[PDB]
Design a protein around this ligand. Structure first.
Ligand SMILES: O=c1ccn([C@@H]2O[C@H](COP(=O)(O)OP(=O)(O)O)[C@@H](O)[C@H]2O)c(=O)[nH]1
Length: 427
């Protein structure tokens, strides 16, 4: 039994992965404590974990959980259709600047919470380094909740966030890595100054320090990047971090499931549906599909309507819906992607940005779904892909087998043994 201290970035994609892993570790009678802003306190307490509040005076205690990222996606909607290269400068770097802003707000509050809680182990799900964790003198694990391609970074291996593969021309890979290094210079220069001020040595190129203890990620064995070598050094693969139960209301009348017809979950994640004009175009196409859609309509749900073959709400109980659908249309977010495979569902992937491009490429390359650019996909492409995947028995059988493998995985038992050994070695 041990006290495990979880520090997630203040967004669904990080918090849900950490809740998933916390529930799995609670099974072994470990006590999991979360450091989050007040608005995230009751949502996490609904899973019966203890919360330590971090102050963020830039966000109200009672702000809607979807407001912070919804307003971001709304403000940057014009970048969501651009090439991965154009997105890097215009969207991903601005996105990382928001991660750095939050890291600077929480970092000064973590050392006192560590002294007061005295955890055995820290688990962080963050895209940038926390000096408070590096300098804690306690064992800490970095949790990757995004697609894991960046953990494989090195010679010959394509960089993440561009949908590239082992088959990409070396010239293109080299060009992308040079572009990323040039593009990140000023952000890294400013970030490193902050690290040095707190007595932390910067990384040569990254602004997120890999744990010298262990680095855990969430990706099915069947999908992992074995073509780029084994599980990377100091890394540990869990097949999934699915929270099996979700406390949220369904979000609409359950009687919808009594309507005859194949059921499709349409969800661009916790923030992507804040691109209202995109949601309107896609819903217009899906309105012509002779199936039934359940739609995660997002922060601006009140600004657009669904046609008669569809039901939707601001935010859905996605765990309750997934076992009742035949197909998922999503943005390639890593939680939604692994949740859909966990329940044996094929997927249509419509990547918006970042690691989603890699999950779109992975769905095509592993023949478990179809991927298109959401702002470009034609009515014919989208309607035909839906009928294709619903009717492809071989592909449905492959996705069922991946779900079986994910559910059969014992890797949580090995993970628990490794963390117990890590705590003993450093005592
Ligand atoms: O209506 C919704 C929309 C999203 N989610 C959850 O929000 C998380 C979104 O994380 P993901 O990595 O899929 O996408 P992100 O929103 O982080 O890009 C997933 O766990 C979903 O199950 C949900 O419960 N209901």
């Amino acid at each position: 039994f041990m006290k495990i201290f979880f520090i997630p970035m203040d967004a669904f994609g990080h918090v849900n992965a950490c809740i998933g892993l916390a529930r799995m570790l609670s099974e072994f009678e470990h006590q999991c404590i979360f450091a989050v802003p007040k608005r995230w306190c009751k949502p996490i307490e609904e899973y019966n974990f203890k919360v330590e509040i971090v102050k963020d005076p830039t966000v109200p205690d009672d702000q809607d959980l979807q407001k912070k990222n919804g307003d971001f996606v709304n403000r940057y909607s014009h970048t969501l259709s651009k090439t991965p290269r154009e997105q890097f400068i215009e969207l991903l770097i601005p996105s990382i600047n928001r991660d750095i802003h939050y890291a600077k707000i929480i970092d000064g509050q973590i050392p006192t919470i560590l002294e007061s809680i005295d955890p055995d182990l820290i688990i962080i799900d963050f895209y940038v380094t926390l000096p408070s964790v590096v300098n804690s003198g306690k064992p800490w694990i970095h949790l990757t909740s995004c697609n894991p391609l960046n953990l494989y970074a090195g010679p010959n291996v394509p960089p993440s966030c561009f949908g590239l593969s082992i088959d990409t021309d070396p010239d293109t890979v080299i060009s992308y890595k040079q572009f990323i290094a040039e593009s990140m210079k000023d952000v890294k220069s400013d970030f490193d100054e902050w690290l040095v001020s707190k007595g932390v040595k910067p990384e040569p190129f990254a602004i997120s320090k890999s744990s010298p203890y262990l680095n855990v990620y969430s990706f099915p064995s069947d999908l992992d990047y074995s073509e780029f070598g084994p599980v990377p050094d100091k890394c540990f693969r869990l097949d999934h971090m699915v929270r099996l139960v979700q406390e949220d209301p369904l979000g609409f009348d359950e009687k919808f499931f009594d309507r005859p017809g194949k059921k499709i979950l349409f969800s661009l994640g916790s923030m992507g549906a804040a691109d209202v004009e995109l949601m309107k175009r896609l819903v217009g196409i899906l309105g012509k599909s002779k199936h039934l859609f359940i739609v995660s309509k997002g922060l601006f749900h009140d600004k657009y309507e669904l046609p008669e073959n569809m039901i939707g709400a601001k935010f859905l109980n996605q765990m309750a819906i997934l076992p009742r659908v035949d197909l998922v249309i999503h943005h390639g977010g890593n939680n939604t992607f692994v949740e859909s495979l966990y329940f044996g569902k094929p997927s249509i992937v419509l990547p918006l940005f970042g690691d989603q491009h890699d999950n779109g490429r992975r769905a095509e390359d592993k023949k478990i779904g179809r991927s298109f650019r959401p702002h470009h996909v034609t009515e014919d492409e989208l309607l035909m892909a839906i009928d294709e995947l619903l009717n492809d028995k071989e592909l449905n059988n492959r996705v069922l087998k991946i779900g079986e493998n994910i559910r059969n995985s014992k890797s949580i038992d090995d993970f628990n043994k490794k963390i117990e050994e890590i705590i003993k070695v450093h005592k």
